[PDB]
């Protein structure tokens, strides 16, 4: 055959997603079972949305989960650079070869290169799991390969980098199956061998919808912060679309590798029941030594939360070393115990309060960098646009973030617990307060886009 080589190719656009870890697990397990290697390629082709910080978050998140790669942006490799943004020169020449070869045309002076697509026939793709995929060529668009800025699109860079990095198997979400005919065609146009394709079912919520941050948290780093062990999380993800022989519910990475058979992957959309993940974490915690449990609690508290920042926040308010527990306890909880009645709506109407927390969630979600200043500018700008006094605007945030009406300055608190935990606590607060109906929620999303950029 040929040396097996798999990959995870995360687009560093936003929070590190559990789904990205789901795919990363099944690519690493597949490779190792076949004596191959697992590499990581950062796909930062969306220049405006891809951030250097978001790249470091994903590498840190997967390393924490226990995944590792033989070649990548950090470790290096014979196929460096491993960021697509630093491969811009490579893609341009191949796109020009597609123009000379009679396989691409320009569409409008500013120009974009587009691929030629057959006008009649079918595309037959072999999926390792679903069998055979047939797609009419007429339902395949003439996708843009090189943009006006000279930078690549996803479809061009994936084919060039997979071929140059000698990828032999690609496992990715079934969302990318409609793009597969484009990929076969590009490999033919370049005279290259297309890797074998296995499309994976997409993780779902309990309501059978697609996994959404709305219904259940979706960030890898949130589960770190909430107290989930990385060994438990990876165990749960390997159990989602897949079952080990004999239906073992708790297993290690090495156990998954040895008995790994791609055909055991179910096609139903796996449901990410956070409660079942929590129980499994309980099993991992109870099978630990008391010494190990102690050391794991201390490490979980020394790394995620910054203690020098917690000390500075509580110093004005503690008169005894024993007060630290009552003033800094919420920094180490997951979701403070709150009730609807706690939001006294004495300054703001309850319907107002919901609108403040929803808009604050979305605005804080898209922050380029999680700094106390960016939090302050965003929340001050939001209170400015609606003409509410800031102290009255922040009243709900004391309840949602700290679980009490009195605490250290809530904005430094949000900076300390982090982006993932702040948003998890805001979304929880909306749910306790009943949320807003589908009709009201869409209207509020409209205003969110009409809002200014509170940081420009």
Ligand X SMILES: Nc1ncnc2c1ncn2[C@@H]1O[C@H](COS(=O)(=O)NC(=O)[C@@H](N)CCC(=O)O)[C@@H](O)[C@H]1O
In the block, residue with structure tokens 């090495």: 254
**Which listed range, 89-97, 125-133, 260-268, 315-323, lies at the site for a copy of itself (CB under 8 A)?**
315-323
Is residue 333 close enough to count as binding a copy of itself by CB under 8 A? yes
Site string for ligand X, 139-158 (x = CB under 6 A): -------------------x
Angstrom CA distances, 388 to 188, 224, 395, stand at: 60, 36, 11
Residue 81 interaction partner, one of a copy of itself, ligand X, none, beta carbon < 5-8 Å per kind: none
Please say which residue, 113 or 229, places its beta carbon nearer to a copy of itself: 229
Does 61 engage in binding with ligand X (CB under 6 A)?
Answer: no
80's torsion region: left (phi>0), alpha (psi -120 to 50) or beta? beta
Catalytic entry in 213, 250, 306, 380? 213
Half-sphere exposure of residue 339, counting CA atoms within 13 Å on the CB side? 3
Question: 291 contacts which partner out of a copy of itself, ligand X, none, CB within 5 to 8 A by kind?
Answer: a copy of itself
∠ CA 331-337-338, rounded to 5°: 115
Which positions ≥6 away from 251 have C-beta within 8 Å? 235, 238, 244
Our measurement of the distance from residue 159's CA atom to the centroid of its chain's CA atoms, rounded to an integer in Å, reads: 23
- For 303, the enclosing helix (H) or strand (E) is helix 290-303
123: enclosing H helix or E strand: strand 122-127
Instruction: Based on the shown chain and the rule CB under 8 A, indicate whether residue 362 belongs to the binding site for a copy of itself.
Output: no
Per-residue tokens: 85: 């943004």
Q: Is the peptide bond before 81 cis (omega within 30 degrees of 0)?
A: yes
The least distance separating ligand X from the CB of residue 18, rounded to whole angstroms, comes to: 8
C-beta of 421: minimal distance to ligand X in Å? 21
Tell me how crowded residue 351 is: count the other CB atoms within 10 A of its CB: 12
With CB cut-offs between 5 and 8 Å by kind, which of a copy of itself, ligand X, none does residue 319 bind?
a copy of itself
Q: Does the annotation list 32 as a binding residue?
A: no
Q: By the 8 A CB rule, do 161 and 85 touch?
A: no
Q: State which residue has the least CB distance to ligand X.
A: 173
End-to-end C-alpha distance for the chain, whole angstroms: 55
Q: Which of residues 370-409 bind a copy of itself (CB under 8 A)?
A: none
Q: Which does 151 bind (CB under 5 to 8 A by kind): a copy of itself, ligand X, none?
A: none
Burial of 191 (0-12, 13-18, 19+ CB in 10 A): exposed
Q: Which does 23 bind (CB under 5 to 8 A by kind): a copy of itself, ligand X, none?
A: ligand X
Binding partner of residue 323 among ligand X, a copy of itself, none, CB under 5 to 8 Å per kind?
A: a copy of itself
334 SS3 class: coil
Cβ atoms of 392 and 348 within 8 Å: the answer is yes
C-beta of 228: minimal distance to ligand X in Å? 18
HEC readout, 54-97:
HHHHHHHHHHHHCCCCCEECCCECCCCCCEHHHHHHHHHHHHHH
Residue number with CB closer to a copy of itself (8 or 226): 226
Please work out the total of residues on this chain that contact ligand X, with binding judged by CB under 6 A.
19
Q: Which residue stretches of 133-172 are H helix?
A: 154-164
**Among 4, 5, 15, 19, contact with ligand X (rule: CB under 6 A):** 19
Separation in Å, CA 384 to CA 355, 356, 390, 391: 15, 12, 8, 12
**Interface positions, 271-290, toward a copy of itself (CB under 8 A):** 278-279, 281-282, 285-286, 288, 290
- The least distance separating ligand X from the CB of residue 307, rounded to whole angstroms, comes to 32
Q: Note whether 342 binds ligand X by CB under 6 A.
A: no
- Which span (29-37, 317-325, 390-398, 406-414) binds a copy of itself, by CB under 8 A? 317-325
Q: How far apart are CB 281 and a copy of itself at their closest, in Å?
A: 6
**CA atoms 270, 366, 69, 280: torsion sign:** negative
Q: Is 213 a catalytic residue?
A: yes
| Residue 329 contact among ligand X, a copy of itself, none, beta carbon within 5 to 8 Å by kind | a copy of itself
CA distance 433 to 215: 15
The only residue of 169, 172, 239, 427 in contact with ligand X, by rule CB under 6 A: 172
* Residues 187-216 within binding reach of ligand X (CB under 6 A): 200, 202-203, 210-211
Task: Give dist(CA 380, CA 372) in Å, integer.
Answer: 12
The minimum distance between CB 202 and ligand X, in angstroms, equals 4
Q: Which residues are annotated as a binding site?
A: 213
Q: Which residues are annotated as a binding site for ATP?
A: 213
The site for ligand X (CB under 6 A) is made up of 9-11, 19-20, 22-23, 43, 158, 170, 172-173, 175-176, 200, 202-203, 210-211
The site for a copy of itself (CB under 8 A) is made up of 225-229, 278-279, 281-282, 285-286, 288, 290-291, 293-294, 296-298, 300-301, 307-308, 310-312, 315-316, 318-326, 329, 332-334
Catalogue the active-site residues: 213
């Amino acid at each position: 055959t040929r040396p097996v080589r798999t990959r995870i190719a995360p687009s560093p656009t936003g929070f590190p997603h559990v789904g990205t870890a789901y795919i990363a697990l099944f690519n690493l397990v597949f490779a190792k079972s076949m004596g191959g290697e697992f590499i990581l390629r950062i796909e930062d082709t969306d220049q405006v949305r891809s951030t250097k910080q978001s790249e470091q978050m994903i590498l840190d998140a997967l390393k924490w989960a226990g995944l590792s790669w033989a070649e990548g942006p950090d470790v290096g490799g014979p196929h460096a650079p491993y960021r697509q943004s630093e491969r811009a020169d490579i893609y341009k020449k191949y796109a020009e070869k597609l123009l000379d070869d009679g396989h691409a045309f320009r569409c409008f002076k500013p120009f974009v290169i587009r691929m030629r697509v057959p006008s009649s026939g079918v595309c037959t793709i072999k999926d390792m799991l679903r069998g055979e995929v047939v797609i009419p060529w007429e339902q395949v668009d003439m996708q843009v390969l090189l943009k006006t800025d000279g930078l690549p699109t996803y479809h061009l860079a994936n084919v060039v980098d997979d071929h140059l990095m000698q990828i032999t198997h690609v496992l990715r979400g079934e969302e990318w199956l409609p793009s597969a005919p484009k990929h076969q065609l590009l490999y033919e146009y370049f005279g290259w061998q297309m890797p074998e394709l296995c499309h994976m079912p997409l993780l779902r919520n309990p309501d059978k919808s697609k996994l959404s941050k709305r219904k259940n948290p979706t960030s890898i780093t949130y589960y770190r912060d909430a107290g989930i062990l990385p060994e438990a999380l990876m165990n749960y993800l390997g159990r989602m679309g897949y079952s080990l022989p004999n239906e073992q519910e708790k297993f290690t990475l090495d156990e998954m590798i040895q008995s790994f058979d791609i055909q055991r992957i179910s096609l139903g959309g796996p449901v990410f029941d956070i409660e079942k993940l929590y129980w499994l974490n309980g099993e991992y915690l109870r099978t630990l030594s008391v010494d190990d449990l102690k050391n794991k609690i201390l490490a979980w508290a020394s790394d995620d939360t910054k203690l020098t920042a917690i000390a500075r926040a509580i110093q004005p308010r503690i008169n005894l070393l024993s007060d630290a527990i009552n003033w800094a306890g919420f920094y180490f909880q997951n979701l403070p115990a709150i009730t609807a009645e706690d939001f006294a709506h004495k300054s703001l109407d309850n319907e107002q309060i919901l609108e403040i927390l929803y808009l604050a969630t979305w605005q804080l979600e898209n922050l380029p960098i999680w700094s106390e200043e960016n939090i302050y500018q965003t929340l001050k700008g939001l209170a400015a646009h609606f003409d509410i006094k800031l102290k009255d605007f922040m009243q709900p945030f004391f309840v949602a973030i700290a679980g009490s009406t009195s605490s250290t300055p809530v904005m430094n608190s949000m900076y300390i617990i982090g982006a993932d935990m702040t948003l998890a606590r805001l979304r929880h607060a909306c749910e306790i307060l009943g949320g807003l109906g589908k009709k009201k929620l869409k209207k509020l999303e409209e205003k969110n886009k009409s809002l200014p950029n509170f940081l420009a």
